[PDB]
Amino acid sequence: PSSNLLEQFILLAKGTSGSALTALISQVLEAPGVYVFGELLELANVQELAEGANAAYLQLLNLFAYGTYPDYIANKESLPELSTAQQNKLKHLTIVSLASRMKCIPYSVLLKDLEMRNLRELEDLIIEAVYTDIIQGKLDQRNQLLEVDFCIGRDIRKKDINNIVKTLHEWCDGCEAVLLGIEQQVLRANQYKENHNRTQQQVEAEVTNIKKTL
Amino acid sequence: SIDEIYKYDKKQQQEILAAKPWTKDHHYFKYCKISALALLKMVMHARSGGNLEVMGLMLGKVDGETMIIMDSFALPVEGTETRVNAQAAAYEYMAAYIENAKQVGRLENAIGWYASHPGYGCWLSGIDVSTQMLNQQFQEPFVAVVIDPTRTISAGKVNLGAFRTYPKGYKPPDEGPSEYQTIPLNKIEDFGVHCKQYYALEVSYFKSSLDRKLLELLWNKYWVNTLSSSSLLTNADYTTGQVFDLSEKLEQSEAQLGRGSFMLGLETHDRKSEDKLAKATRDSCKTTIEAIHGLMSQVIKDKLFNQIN
Amino acid sequence: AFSFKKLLDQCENQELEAPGGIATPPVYGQLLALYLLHNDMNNARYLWKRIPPAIKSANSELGGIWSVGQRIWQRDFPGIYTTINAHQWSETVQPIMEALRDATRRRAFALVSQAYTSIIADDFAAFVGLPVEEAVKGILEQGWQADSTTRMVLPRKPIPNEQQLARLTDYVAFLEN
Ligand SMILES: [Zn+2]
Incomplete structure (x- = not known):
């Protein structure tokens, strides 16, 4: 029901705003379930908060959108004080960023x-x-490793679109290279078959020539 | 010409049936060519039978030492063969279907029977041997095909065999590879009693338009999960048993050669020894090339997926 | 190394194309020195036996190099370094003798690291041809362990896709026919 609650607050944000919106955003950071905050950031009233006097909650929401837990620790003076649910949600989001890069997380990195x-x-x-x-x-407790098979994603500052395009282009180039290699292997197999057929026809021609000789 | 085999020449079949070259040699028929349609239908029937044996008839023709198969069809088995044999209203549907095929085109007549052995391998039991001996006395050109739906799933490749019986009293020659097969303890006694009363034909296909279409379609459709690991040969069973059979055959050949080295002037011994060595070599080569293909697919796909970028 | 191998090939060619059948003493000295560099003791020994005694008597340096080679055969490293640094080598022999000394250092350094989990400091010092103390700092900076009480040294022991596809294709081509 997080998406339905997220959409309702989106509809409410189209109207009422201000301190109520900031408290509403704080409730979002406290209510479990919401793991994506990009849809909230796209709202025009969030941009209204940008020019507004209040910015602690916006910098708080901005950090939950892109930043991680260590960034929040440094910003303890500029961000509103979080709750237990807000801290746990940010820690879960930070784990998502960590698990996104490396699929095996040692316990040492987790403790740090x-x-x-x-x-x-x-x-x-x-x-x-x-x-x-x-x-x-x-x-894996014996090796003190956290093996993550699948994890959710995160939002993008419109700057990782170039990285996505580059990765897709690299994948396409690799697929084309493998296709060309497969075609070359097929051609080589056909050439080997042709050579075998040429050897067979040479043998049969030699046999027929000797038969004609005798 | 891929489709040349689909041409039916009635007069040529009548000429072959009048000639009866199989009466001149009990090892006359050596090859069994099965159409993609036939294979699919038979396998489907066998697996629908589940753990129960089912059977049917095969339509086809003969060409030299080769027996060909095209079609197959179920016979009314009310109450799962509550009467003698899996026939009941047999030729009722059979002869109707036959006249109906002479009407809609299919002119290939009965060439054999197929039976299923769910989870106990391809071979002929005592009952199967009696049945096939009868078929080799009336419809002389007949072939006992055995399928295995459970092994079809276990090993991955369809377990299929084509067999022909020897006439009562007639002994097979020394030549005989005899591939090893895992036979359950409730069947092994009967297997051993009758295993030398018949021989196995070489089962081969010929591609075809039926194959081209069917294969391409189902392949793409379900193989999106192209992985299926990559080595269903990982199960020791099949490979191990094949290698054991190879070892046994080669050791038998060595024992023969050692005893034949004393006899000076026995050409037949040299002939069969060379043939057995050659058969062993080709079997090993086919196993090797299958493993190499598996490794090739595994390597290409794994390299593509893991570290492409 | 690569230049030394090229020089060795040229010297070997010059020996084969010798007009009078005998090479100049500089060529023989380079040939003997380069064989010692590559630890090719068999070729060095056979070349020494091939050289006529007239050159050996007329060139005492050639005998000195052979004495160094004999020390290398016996693998007495303290003797090897002493003999290398005892005889003055000419401008064509000094640089290659220094390379031979460097080659001996690397060979002895790796030999100790492999077969010696623990070695006396004096023994390791003798093997590397250096006194004990700075040899210890030489291996401490090498990430090794040394015990001062027992004077024992504990050394620390340290296909592309196209080729694979070609090899698999060779598999298939060989097994197809
Ligand atoms: Zn049966």
Whole structure:
């Protein structure tokens, strides 16, 4: 029901705004379920908050859209104080960014990036993220590694579109190269078959010539 | 010409049936060519039978030492063969279907029978041998084809065999590779009793328009999951048994050669020894090339997927 | 190394095309020195036996190089370094003798690292032809372990897609016919 709640707040943001909108955004950051905040940022009333006097909540929402937990720690003076749900949601989002790059996350990296001291609560944060359909994977406690098979994505500052295009172009070029290699292998196999047929026809011609000789 | 085999020459078939060259040699028929349509229909019937044996008739023709198959059709089996044999109202539907095919075109007559062995391999039981011996006494050009739906899933490749019986009293020659097959304990006794009363034909296809269309379509349609791991040969069973059979055959050839080295002037021994060595070599080569193809597909696909960019 | 191999090939060719059948003493000296560099003891020994004694008597430096080669055959590294640094090598022999000394250092350094989990500092010092103390700092900067109490040294032991496709195609072509 997060998407339905997200759409209702989008409809409400088209009307009422101001301090109510900032409190509404804070409720979004506290209500579990919402893992995508790009749709909220596209609203014109968010841009109204840009020129408005209040900016702590907008910088808070902006960080949840693109930034991670370590950025929020540095901005403890400029961002509104978060709740337990808000901190957990940001930590889950930070894990999403970490799991997006590397599919195997050692426990050392987990304890470092999320200000994680106790490993027991680290497991609780990890299992909570998995159980809410955020990340999919398996945990390796002997090697202290977090193997993530599948994870959700994140929003883009319109600057990663170029990276997406470059990656798609590289994939297309690789596919074309493999297709050309397969065609070359097929041609080589056809040439080998032709050589074998030429050897067979030479043998049969030699046999027929000797038969005619005798 | 890919479609040349589909041409039916009635007079030529009558000429072959009048000539009866199979009476001159009990090993006359060596090859069995099966049409894609026939194969598909038979396999589908076998798997619909599930764990129960089903059977049907095969329509086709003969060409030299080769028996050809095109069609196949179920016979009313009320109450799962509550009467003797899986026939009941047999030629009722059969003869109707036959006149109906002479009407809509299909002129290929009965060339054999197929039977299914769900989960116990392709071979002829005592009952199968009696049935095929009868078929080799009335419709002399007949072939007992056995399918295996459960092994079709287990090994991945369809388990299929084509067989012909020897007449009562007649002994096979020494030549005989005899590929090893896993036979369950409730069937192994009967298998062993009758295994030398028949021989296996070489089963081969010839591509075709039926193949081209069918293959392409279903292939693309379901192989989007092109992975299917990549090696269904990973199961030791098949490969291991094949290699064991090869070893046994080659060791038998060696024992023969060692005893034949004392006899000076036995050309037949040299002939059969060379033939057995050659058969062993080709079987090994086919297994090797299959494994190489599997590895090629695996390598290409894995390299493409993992580190393309 | 590559230039030394090219020089060795040229020297070997010059020996084969010798007009009078005998090469100049500089060529023989370079040939013997280059064989010692590559640790080709068999070729060096056979070349020394091939050289007539007249050149050996007329060129005491040639005998000195052979004595160095004999030390290399016996693999007495303290003797090898002492003999290398004892005889003055000419301008055509000094640079290659220095390369031979460097080659001996690398060979001994790797030999100890492989077969010696623990080695006495004096033994390692003798093997590398350096006194003990700066040899320790030479291997500490090499990321090795040294025990000062027992004077023991603990060294730390350290196809493209196209080719694969070609090899698989060769598989298929061979097994097809
Ligand atoms: Zn049966």
